[PDB]
Coordinates of C-alpha atoms in Angstrom, one line a residue:
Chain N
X4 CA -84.5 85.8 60.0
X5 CA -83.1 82.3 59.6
X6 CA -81.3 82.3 55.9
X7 CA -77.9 83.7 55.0
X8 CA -78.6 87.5 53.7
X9 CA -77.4 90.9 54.2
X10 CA -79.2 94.7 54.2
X11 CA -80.2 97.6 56.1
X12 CA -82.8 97.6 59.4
X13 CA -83.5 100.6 61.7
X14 CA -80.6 102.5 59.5
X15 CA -78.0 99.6 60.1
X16 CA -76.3 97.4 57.8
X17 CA -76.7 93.8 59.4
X18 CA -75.6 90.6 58.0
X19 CA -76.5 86.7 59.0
X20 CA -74.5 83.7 58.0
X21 CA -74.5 80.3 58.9
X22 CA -73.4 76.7 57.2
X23 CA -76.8 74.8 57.9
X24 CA -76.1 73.3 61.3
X25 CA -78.0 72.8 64.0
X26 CA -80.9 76.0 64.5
X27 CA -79.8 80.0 64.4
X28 CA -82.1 82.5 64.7
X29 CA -81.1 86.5 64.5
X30 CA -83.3 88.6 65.9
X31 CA -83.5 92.4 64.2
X32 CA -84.5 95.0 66.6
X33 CA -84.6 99.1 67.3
X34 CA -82.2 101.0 66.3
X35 CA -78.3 99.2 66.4
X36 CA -79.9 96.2 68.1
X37 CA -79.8 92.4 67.2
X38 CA -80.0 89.3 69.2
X39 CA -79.3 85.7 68.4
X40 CA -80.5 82.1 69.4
X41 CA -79.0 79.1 68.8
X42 CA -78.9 75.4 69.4
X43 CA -75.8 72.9 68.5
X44 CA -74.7 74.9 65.3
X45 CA -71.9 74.4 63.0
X46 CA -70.8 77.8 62.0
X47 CA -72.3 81.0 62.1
X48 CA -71.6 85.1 61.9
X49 CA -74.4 87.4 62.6
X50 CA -74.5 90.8 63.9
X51 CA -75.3 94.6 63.0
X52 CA -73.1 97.2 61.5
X53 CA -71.7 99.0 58.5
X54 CA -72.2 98.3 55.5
X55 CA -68.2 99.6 54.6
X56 CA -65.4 99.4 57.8
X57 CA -64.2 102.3 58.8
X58 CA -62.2 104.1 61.2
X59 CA -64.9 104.2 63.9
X60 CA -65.3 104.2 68.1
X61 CA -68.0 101.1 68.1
X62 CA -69.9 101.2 71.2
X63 CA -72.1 98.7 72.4
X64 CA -73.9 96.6 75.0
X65 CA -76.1 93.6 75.8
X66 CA -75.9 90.1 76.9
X67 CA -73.6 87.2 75.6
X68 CA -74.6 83.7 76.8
X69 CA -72.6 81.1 75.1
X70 CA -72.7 77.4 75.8
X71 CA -69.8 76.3 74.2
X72 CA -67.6 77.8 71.4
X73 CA -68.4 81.2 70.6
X74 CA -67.1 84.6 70.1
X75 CA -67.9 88.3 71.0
X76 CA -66.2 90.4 68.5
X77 CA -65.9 93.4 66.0
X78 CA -65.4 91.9 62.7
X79 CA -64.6 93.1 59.0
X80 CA -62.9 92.6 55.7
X81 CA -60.5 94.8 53.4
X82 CA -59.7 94.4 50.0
X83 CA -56.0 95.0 49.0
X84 CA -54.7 93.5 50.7
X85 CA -57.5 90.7 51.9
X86 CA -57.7 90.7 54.9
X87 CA -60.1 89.3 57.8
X88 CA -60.2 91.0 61.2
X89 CA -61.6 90.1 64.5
X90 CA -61.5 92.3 68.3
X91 CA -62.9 90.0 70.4
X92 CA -64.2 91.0 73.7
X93 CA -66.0 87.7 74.7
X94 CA -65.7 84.3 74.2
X95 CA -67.1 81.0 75.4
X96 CA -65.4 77.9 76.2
X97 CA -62.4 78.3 73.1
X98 CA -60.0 81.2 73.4
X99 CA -59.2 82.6 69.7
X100 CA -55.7 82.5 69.1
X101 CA -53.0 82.1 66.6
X102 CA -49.4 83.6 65.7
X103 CA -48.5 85.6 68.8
X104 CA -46.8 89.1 67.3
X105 CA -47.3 91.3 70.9
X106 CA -50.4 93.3 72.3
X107 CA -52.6 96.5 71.7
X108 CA -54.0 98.6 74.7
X109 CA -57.0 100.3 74.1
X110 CA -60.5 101.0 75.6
X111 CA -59.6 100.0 79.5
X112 CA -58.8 96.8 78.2
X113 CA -55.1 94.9 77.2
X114 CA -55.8 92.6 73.9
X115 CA -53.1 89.9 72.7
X116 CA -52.4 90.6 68.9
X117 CA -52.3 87.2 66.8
X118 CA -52.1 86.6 63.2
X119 CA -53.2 83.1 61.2
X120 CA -53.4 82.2 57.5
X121 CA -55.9 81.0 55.8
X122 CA -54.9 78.7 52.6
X123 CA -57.4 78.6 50.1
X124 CA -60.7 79.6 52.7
X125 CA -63.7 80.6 51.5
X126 CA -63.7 84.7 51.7
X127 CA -65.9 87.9 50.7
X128 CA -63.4 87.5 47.4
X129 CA -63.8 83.8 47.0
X130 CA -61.6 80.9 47.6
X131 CA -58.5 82.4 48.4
X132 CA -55.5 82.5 50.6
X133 CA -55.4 85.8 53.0
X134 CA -54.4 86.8 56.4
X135 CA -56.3 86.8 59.8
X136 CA -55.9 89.9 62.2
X137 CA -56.5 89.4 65.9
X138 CA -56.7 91.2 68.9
X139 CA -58.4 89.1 71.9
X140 CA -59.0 90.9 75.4
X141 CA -56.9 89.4 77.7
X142 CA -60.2 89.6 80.2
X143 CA -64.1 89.0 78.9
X144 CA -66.1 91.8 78.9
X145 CA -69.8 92.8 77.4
X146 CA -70.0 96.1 76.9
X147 CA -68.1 99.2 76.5
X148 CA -66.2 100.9 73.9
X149 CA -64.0 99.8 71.0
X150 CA -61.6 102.1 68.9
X151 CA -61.5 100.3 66.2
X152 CA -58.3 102.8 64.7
X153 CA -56.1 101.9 68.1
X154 CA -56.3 98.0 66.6
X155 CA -55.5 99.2 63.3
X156 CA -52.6 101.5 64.1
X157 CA -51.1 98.9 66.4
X158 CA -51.5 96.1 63.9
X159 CA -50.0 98.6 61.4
X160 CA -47.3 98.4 63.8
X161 CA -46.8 95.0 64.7
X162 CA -46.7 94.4 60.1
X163 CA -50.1 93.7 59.7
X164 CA -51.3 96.3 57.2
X165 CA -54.9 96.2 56.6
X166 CA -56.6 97.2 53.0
X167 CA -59.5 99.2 51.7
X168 CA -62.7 99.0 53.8
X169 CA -64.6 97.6 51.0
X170 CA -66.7 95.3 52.7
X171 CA -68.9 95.5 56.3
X172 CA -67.8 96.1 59.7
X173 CA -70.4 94.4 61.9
X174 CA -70.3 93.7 65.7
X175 CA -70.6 90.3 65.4
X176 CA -71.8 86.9 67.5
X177 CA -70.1 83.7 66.1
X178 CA -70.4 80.4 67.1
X179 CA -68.7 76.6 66.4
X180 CA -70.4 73.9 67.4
X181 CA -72.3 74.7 70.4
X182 CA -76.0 76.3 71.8
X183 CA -76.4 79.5 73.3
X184 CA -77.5 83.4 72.8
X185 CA -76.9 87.4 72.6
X186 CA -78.4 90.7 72.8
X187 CA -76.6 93.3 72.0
X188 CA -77.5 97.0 71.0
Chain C
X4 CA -21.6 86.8 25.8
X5 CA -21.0 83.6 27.8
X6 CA -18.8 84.8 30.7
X7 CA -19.3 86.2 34.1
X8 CA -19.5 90.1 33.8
X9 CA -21.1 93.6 34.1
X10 CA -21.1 96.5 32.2
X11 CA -22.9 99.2 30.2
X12 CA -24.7 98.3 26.3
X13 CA -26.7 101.3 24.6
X14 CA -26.7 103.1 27.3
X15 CA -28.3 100.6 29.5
X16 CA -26.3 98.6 32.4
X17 CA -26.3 94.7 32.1
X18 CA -25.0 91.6 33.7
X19 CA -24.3 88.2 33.2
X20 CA -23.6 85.3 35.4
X21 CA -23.8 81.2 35.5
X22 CA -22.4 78.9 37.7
X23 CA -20.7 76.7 34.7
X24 CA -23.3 74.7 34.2
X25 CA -24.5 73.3 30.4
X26 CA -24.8 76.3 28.3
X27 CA -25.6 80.2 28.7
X28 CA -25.5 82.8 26.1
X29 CA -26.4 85.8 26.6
X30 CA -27.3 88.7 23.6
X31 CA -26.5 92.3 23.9
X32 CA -28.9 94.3 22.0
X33 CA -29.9 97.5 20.8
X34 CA -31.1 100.1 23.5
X35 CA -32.4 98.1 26.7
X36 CA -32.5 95.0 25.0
X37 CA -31.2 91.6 25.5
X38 CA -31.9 87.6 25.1
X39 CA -30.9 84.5 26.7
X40 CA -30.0 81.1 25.4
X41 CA -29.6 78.1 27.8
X42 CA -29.3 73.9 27.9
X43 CA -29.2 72.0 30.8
X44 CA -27.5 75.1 32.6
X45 CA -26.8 74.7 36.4
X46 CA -27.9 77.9 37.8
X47 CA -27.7 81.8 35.6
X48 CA -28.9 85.3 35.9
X49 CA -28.9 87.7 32.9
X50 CA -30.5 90.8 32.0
X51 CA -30.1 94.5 31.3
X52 CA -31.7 97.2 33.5
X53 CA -30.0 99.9 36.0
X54 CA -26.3 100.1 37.7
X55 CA -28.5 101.0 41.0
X56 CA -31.6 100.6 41.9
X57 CA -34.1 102.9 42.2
X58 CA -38.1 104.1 42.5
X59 CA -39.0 103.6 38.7
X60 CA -41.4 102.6 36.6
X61 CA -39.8 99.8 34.7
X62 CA -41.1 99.1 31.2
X63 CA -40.5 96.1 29.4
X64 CA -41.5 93.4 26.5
X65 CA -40.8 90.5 24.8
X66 CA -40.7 86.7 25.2
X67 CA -40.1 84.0 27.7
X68 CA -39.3 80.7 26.8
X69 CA -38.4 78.4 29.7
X70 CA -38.3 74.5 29.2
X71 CA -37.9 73.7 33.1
X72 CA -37.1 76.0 35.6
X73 CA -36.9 79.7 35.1
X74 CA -37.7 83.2 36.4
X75 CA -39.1 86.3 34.6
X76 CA -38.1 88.9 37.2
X77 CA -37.2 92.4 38.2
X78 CA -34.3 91.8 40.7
X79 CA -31.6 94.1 42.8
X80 CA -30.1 94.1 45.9
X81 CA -30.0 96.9 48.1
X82 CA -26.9 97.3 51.3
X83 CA -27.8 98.6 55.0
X84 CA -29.6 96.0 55.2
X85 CA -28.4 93.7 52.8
X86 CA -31.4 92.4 50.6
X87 CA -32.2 90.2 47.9
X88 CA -35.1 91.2 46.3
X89 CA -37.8 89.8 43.2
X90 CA -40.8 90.8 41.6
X91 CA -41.6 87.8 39.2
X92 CA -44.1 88.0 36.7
X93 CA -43.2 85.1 34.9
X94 CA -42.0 81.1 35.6
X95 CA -41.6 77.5 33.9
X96 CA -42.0 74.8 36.3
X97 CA -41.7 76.6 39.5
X98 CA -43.3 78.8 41.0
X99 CA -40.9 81.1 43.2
X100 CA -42.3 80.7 47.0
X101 CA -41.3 81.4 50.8
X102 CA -42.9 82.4 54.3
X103 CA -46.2 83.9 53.0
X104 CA -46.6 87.3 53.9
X105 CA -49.6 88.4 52.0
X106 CA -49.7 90.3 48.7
X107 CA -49.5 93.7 46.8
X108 CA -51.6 94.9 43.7
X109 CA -49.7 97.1 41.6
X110 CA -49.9 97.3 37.2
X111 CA -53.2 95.3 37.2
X112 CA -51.8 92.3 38.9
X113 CA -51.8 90.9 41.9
X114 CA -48.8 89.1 43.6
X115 CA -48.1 87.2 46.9
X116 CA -45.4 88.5 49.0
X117 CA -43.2 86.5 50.3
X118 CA -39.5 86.4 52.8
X119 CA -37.0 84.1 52.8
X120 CA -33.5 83.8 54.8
X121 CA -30.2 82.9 53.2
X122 CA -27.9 81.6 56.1
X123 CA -24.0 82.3 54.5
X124 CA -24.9 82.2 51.2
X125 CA -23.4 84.3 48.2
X126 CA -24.2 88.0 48.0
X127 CA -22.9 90.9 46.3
X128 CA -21.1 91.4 49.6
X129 CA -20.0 88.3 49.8
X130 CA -20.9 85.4 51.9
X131 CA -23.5 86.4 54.3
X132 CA -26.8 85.7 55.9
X133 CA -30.1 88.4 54.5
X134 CA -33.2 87.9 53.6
X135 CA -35.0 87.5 50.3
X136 CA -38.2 89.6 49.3
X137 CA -40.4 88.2 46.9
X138 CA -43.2 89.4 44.7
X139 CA -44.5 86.9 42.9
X140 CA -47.6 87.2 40.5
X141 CA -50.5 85.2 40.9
X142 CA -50.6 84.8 36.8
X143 CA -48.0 84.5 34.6
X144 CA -47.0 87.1 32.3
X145 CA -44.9 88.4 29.7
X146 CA -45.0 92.2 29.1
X147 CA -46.0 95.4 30.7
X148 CA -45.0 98.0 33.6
X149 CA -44.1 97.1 36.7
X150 CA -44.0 100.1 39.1
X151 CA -41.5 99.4 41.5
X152 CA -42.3 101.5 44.8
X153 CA -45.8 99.6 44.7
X154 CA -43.5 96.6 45.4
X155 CA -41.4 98.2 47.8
X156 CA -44.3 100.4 49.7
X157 CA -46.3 96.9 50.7
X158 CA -42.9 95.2 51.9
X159 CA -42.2 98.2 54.1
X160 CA -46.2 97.7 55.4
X161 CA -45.4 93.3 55.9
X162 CA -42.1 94.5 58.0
X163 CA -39.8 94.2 55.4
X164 CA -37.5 96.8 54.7
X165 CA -35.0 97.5 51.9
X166 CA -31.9 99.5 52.0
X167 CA -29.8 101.4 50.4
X168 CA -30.1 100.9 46.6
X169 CA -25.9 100.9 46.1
X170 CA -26.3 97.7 43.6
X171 CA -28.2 96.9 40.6
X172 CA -31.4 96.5 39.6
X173 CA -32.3 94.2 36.4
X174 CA -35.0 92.7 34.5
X175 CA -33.8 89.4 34.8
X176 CA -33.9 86.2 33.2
X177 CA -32.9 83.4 35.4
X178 CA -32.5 79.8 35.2
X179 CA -31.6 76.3 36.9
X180 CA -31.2 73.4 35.9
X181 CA -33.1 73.7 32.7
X182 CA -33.0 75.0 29.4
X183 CA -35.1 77.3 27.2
X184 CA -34.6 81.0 25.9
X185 CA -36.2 84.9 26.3
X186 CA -36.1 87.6 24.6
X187 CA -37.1 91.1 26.5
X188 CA -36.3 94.8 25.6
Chain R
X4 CA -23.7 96.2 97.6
X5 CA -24.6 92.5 96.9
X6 CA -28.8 92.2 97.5
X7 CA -31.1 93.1 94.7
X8 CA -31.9 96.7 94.4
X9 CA -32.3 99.7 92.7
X10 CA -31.4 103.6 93.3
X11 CA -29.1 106.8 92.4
X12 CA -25.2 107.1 92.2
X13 CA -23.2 109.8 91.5
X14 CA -26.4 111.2 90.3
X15 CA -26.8 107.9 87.8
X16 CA -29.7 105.6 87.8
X17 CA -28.8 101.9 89.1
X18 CA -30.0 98.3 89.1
X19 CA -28.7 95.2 90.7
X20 CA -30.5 91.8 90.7
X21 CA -29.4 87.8 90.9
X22 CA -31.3 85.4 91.5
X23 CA -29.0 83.8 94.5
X24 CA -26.9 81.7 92.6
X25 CA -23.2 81.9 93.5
X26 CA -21.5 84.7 94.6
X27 CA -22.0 88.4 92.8
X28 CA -21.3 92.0 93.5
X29 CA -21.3 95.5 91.8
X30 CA -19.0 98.5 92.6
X31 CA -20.7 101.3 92.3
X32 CA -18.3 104.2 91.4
X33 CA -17.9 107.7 90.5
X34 CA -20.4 109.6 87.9
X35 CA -21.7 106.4 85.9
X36 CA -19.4 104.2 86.7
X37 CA -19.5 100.6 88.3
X38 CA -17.8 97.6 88.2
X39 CA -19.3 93.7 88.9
X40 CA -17.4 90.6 90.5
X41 CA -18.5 87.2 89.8
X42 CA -18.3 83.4 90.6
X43 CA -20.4 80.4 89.5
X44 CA -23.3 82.8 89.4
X45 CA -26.9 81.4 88.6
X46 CA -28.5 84.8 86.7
X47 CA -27.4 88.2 87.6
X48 CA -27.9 91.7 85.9
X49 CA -26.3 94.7 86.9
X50 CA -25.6 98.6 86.0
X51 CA -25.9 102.1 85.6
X52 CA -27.9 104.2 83.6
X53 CA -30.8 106.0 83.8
X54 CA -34.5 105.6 85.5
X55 CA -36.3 106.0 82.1
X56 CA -35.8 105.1 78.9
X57 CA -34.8 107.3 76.0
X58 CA -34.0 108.1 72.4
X59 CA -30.1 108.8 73.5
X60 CA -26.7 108.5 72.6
X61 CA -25.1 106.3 75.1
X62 CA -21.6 106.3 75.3
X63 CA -19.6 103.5 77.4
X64 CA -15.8 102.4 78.2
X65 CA -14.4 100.1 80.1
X66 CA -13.1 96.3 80.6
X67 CA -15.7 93.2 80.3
X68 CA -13.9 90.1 81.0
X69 CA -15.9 86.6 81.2
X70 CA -15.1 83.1 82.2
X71 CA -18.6 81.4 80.9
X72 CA -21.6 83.3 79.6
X73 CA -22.1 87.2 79.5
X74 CA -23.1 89.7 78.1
X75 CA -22.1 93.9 78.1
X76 CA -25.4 95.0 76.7
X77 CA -27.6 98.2 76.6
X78 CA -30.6 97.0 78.5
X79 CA -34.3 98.5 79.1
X80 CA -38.1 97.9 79.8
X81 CA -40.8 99.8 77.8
X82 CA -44.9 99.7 78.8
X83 CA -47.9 99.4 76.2
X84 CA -46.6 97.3 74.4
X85 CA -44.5 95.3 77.4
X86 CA -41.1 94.9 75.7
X87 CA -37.4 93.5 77.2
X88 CA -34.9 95.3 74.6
X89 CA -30.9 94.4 74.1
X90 CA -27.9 95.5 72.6
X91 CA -25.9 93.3 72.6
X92 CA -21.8 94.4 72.0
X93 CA -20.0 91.5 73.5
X94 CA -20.8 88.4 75.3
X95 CA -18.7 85.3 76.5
X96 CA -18.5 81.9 75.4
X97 CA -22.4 82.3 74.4
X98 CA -24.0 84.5 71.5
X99 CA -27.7 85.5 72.3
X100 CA -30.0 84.7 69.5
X101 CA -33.5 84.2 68.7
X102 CA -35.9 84.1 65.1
X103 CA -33.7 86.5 62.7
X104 CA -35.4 89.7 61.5
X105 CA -32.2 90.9 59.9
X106 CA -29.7 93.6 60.3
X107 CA -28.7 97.3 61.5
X108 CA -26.2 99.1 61.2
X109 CA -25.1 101.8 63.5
X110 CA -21.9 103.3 65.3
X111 CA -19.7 101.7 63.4
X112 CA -21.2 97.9 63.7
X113 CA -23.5 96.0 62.1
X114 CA -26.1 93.9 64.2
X115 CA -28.0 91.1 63.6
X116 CA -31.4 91.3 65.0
X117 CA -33.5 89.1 66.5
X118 CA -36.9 88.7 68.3
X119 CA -37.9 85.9 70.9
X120 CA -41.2 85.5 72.7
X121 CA -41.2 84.9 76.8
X122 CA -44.1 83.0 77.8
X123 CA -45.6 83.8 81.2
X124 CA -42.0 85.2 82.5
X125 CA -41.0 87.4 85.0
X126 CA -41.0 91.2 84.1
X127 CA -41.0 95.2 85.1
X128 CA -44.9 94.1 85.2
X129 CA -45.0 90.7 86.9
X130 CA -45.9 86.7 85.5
X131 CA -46.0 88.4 81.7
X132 CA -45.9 87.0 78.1
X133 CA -44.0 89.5 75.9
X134 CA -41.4 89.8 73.1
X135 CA -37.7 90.3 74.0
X136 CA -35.9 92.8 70.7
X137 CA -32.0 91.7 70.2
X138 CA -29.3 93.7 68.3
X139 CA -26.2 91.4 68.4
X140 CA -22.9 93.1 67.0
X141 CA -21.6 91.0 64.7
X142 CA -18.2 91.5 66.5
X143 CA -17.2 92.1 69.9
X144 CA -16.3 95.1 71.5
X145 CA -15.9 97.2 74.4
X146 CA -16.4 100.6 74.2
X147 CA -17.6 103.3 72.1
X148 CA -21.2 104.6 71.2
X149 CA -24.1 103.0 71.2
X150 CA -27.0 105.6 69.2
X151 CA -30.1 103.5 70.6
X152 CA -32.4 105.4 68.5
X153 CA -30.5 103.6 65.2
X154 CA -31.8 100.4 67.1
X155 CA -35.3 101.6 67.7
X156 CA -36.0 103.0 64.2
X157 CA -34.7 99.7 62.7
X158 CA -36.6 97.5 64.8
X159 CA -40.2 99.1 64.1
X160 CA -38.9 99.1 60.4
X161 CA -39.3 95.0 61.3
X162 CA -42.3 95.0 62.8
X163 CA -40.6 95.7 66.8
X164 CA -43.0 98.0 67.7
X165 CA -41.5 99.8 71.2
X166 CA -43.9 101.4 73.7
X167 CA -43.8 103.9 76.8
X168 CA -40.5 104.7 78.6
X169 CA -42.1 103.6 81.7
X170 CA -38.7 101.9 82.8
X171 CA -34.8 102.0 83.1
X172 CA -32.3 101.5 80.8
X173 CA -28.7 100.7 81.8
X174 CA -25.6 99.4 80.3
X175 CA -25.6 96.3 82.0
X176 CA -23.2 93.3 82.3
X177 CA -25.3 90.2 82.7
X178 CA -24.0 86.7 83.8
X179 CA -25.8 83.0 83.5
X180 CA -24.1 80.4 85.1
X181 CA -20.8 81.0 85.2
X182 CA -17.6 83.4 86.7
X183 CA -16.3 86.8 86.1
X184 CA -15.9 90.9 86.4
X185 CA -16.5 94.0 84.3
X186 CA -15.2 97.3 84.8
X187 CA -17.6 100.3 82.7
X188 CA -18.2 103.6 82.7

């Protein structure tokens, strides 16, 4: 696919987004699996999932080949509060940060926890203002396992309470402004 | 009345204040009912509600009549820690903010949350440093329930908690440097 | 002794480390008890306690007595997250500080508290970035009881999450630049 749409392939809620620029393509395969091309985008999301987030261990592998800014992360939405979340296991040539509030260990792996705030972004509720939840590996990896509830509870934690799982869950490719792709199952 | 004081009217506790400034009447009424008068006042606080503070449902009516600057708020203070707290469903010609926290949805509303830090300012303790929790709807109303513990339940979840409720809780009508009037039961 | 180190003492965990500057020692005495001489000192901690960490009552008496800046604080390492904690009961001619949180109120004190971030500082775990919790009584003392658990509870209640006893804590006097003794058991 190449326009903005969501819905179910090989059992799997999947989702692709982008703002026009430069070329995206998202390719739906077997199973979990999606891969994505791309050459000097603006912005897009696209990856495969749930349809609703949940309290889940997400496991997953592939390939990750950015060429400039991108990001390799689990990535949802709850509603009450709003609330967008990101665990980012891979990135390209920008680190995601924000707020610093501490860090979460989990899956092998030691993630920084950030929060930022949006002011009147566009969301899955509309324009609106709304909080960002982080948690970016302090090392890059593809692959492996994510607990998705050890990044909740230690958000929980750290004051960042999330909301309802009303919207998807997807394990997401992102880019800004760059070229590159990803397979990942 | 129009002087600094506290007490109990139909069964319901009450208190009055203003810094001196222009003029501030306030009406004693049947049951939990009370109204305000004000010109040009420098700063005020009036309303009737509960010697201490407590989980409730709080209940109220009327009308809200600010011509400048003016609250419509629940509002108490709580000891160990020492907090300042407001749930605002109503304002004239500013709106109540702070550091944004996020929000709460409680009695079909929905209200940022907000903190703010009074360095040796005036408490019911006297002059000290605390913080301020806010509430603060996202449209203006006048009349309803507003359940209190909602309030309280998503400040505890932004990192803000309250202590011990060993003051007051009112629905308050507040001004500064304005005039106008209410009316609330 | 006088060169950096850690060990047992009258069957009492013990720490001493300066960085060099000027001249420091520590007295290590019976049960938990120690002493600490110094002049024009650079940084130095020192005390006793124990090897882990602990929800305890601590209980501590003694002189402190500071020409410059000090402080007689409860002092500890925790793992997952990485966290430096204080509590703070006296101090010199500076008062440690940081971004305000708020209060607690335990063993007969109240204490501000405060959180500052370290950037890619020394720790229990190397080169780290990681957030330093404060409790600062609000007046100086020596002696008495310090429940740490009071502190603990209070801080997660601000968002201070704590993690894994992994290291000491000790009642430690702890010089920067400047001259001195302590005397505390």
């Amino acid at each position: 696919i190449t326009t903005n749409q969501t819905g179910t392939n090989n059992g799997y809620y999947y989702s692709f987004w982008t703002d026009g620029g430069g070329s995206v393509s998202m390719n739906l395969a077997s199973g979990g699996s999606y891969g994505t091309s791309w050459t000097n985008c603006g912005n897009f999301v696209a990856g495969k999932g749930w349809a609703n987030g949940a309290r889940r261990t997400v496991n997953y592998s592939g390939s990750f080949n950015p060429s400039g800014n991108a990001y390799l992360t689990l990535y949802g939405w709850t509603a009450n509060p709003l609330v967008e979340y990101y665990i980012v296991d891979n990135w390209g040539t920008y680190r995601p940060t924000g707020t610093y509030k501490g860090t979460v260990t989990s899956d092998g792996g030691t993630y920084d926890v950030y929060q930022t705030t949006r002011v009147n972004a566009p969301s899955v509720e509309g324009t609106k203002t709304f909080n960002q939840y982080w948690s970016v590996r302090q090392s890059k990896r593809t692959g492996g396992s994510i607990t998705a509830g050890n990044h909740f509870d230690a958000w929980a934690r750290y004051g960042m309470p999330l909301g309802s799982f009303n919207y998807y869950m997807i394990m997401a490719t992102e880019g800004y402004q760059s070229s590159g792709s990803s397979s990942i199952s």
